[PDB]
Design a protein around this ligand. Structure first.
Ligand SMILES: O=c1cc(CP(=O)(O)O)c2c(Br)cc(Br)cc2[nH]1
Ligand SMILES: [Zn+2]
Ligand SMILES: [Zn+2]
Length: 229
């Protein structure tokens, strides 16, 4: 189950796939968990999302060194907010090649983030343009449309039952869609459904702020998003 490593938590989800979890204290609200992914692809490791901070992200890399002990070939971050991109400097200090939606890199300075080194662009169907995501191995990057933010992207892991919705998707019992300050209220529902349609055989849905769930996370997120229109 959960492996505590310093102030972070790591959970194996499948062969070659682990979830990383980091926490940021919010006075009057609580300590908020944020989840990303670590994937071993043969002799290298791929990371989805930073932790909230550089220090926590360096701890992710320390855990990888202890538990996997293979080079981290790249990281892809799923939108330009702190829970997904706050540790970019730690990745760069470690010499890891970093990738984000072109729009995330454009937004990064004003959002207080450090931009990734490389920009992903997307075809009209939402799939990443392959030239912009070289050597991504089993990572299948998909832009579902605007939802939690205008730049949110999602990632499936080929060879597994796992798809990652980042902050776009909430769990099947979530009370609400949470912070909608940067959200696209008109398009959220369709964007959530587009994520599910891009990864139709994914039975384990991973997300930023809940434990992995069934595909009911997708249907429930979309049904709540219907109310925004
Ligand atoms: O600033 C924040 C950011 C998030 C993450 P989100 O915006 O991606 O949903 C957050 C969350 Br989950 C829960 C609470 Br309680 C407070 C929060 N405050
Ligand atoms: Zn966000
Ligand atoms: Zn989030």
């Amino acid at each position: 189950g959960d492996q505590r490593f310093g102030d972070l938590v790591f959970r194996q989800l499948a062969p070659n796939v682990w979830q990383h979890t980091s926490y940021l204290d919010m006075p009057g609200f609580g300590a908020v968990a944020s989840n990303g992914l670590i994937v071993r692809d043969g002799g290298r490791v791929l990371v989805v999302d930073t932790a909230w901070t550089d220090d926590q992200t360096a701890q992710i890399l320390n855990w990888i060194k202890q538990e996997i002990n293979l080079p981290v070939a790249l990281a892809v971050v799923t939108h330009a907010h702190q829970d997904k991109m706050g540790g970019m400097d730690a990745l760069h200090a470690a010499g890891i090649a970093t990738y984000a939606n072109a729009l995330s890199n454009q937004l990064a300075p004003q959002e207080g983030m450090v931009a990734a080194q490389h920009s992903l662009t997307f075809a009209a169907n939402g799939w990443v343009e392959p030239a912009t995501a070289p050597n991504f191995g089993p990572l299948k990057v998909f832009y579902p449309g605007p939802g939690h933010t205008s730049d949110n992207i999602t990632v499936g892991i080929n060879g597994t039952d796992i798809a990652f919705g980042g902050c776009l998707i909430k769990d099947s019992k979530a009370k609400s869609l949470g912070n909608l300050g940067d959200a696209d209220t008109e398009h959220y529902a369709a964007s959530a459904r587009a994520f599910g349609a891009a990864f139709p055989k994914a039975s384990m849905i991973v997300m930023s702020h809940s434990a992995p769930d069934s595909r009911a996370a997708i249907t429930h997120t979309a049904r709540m998003a219907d109310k925004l229109r």
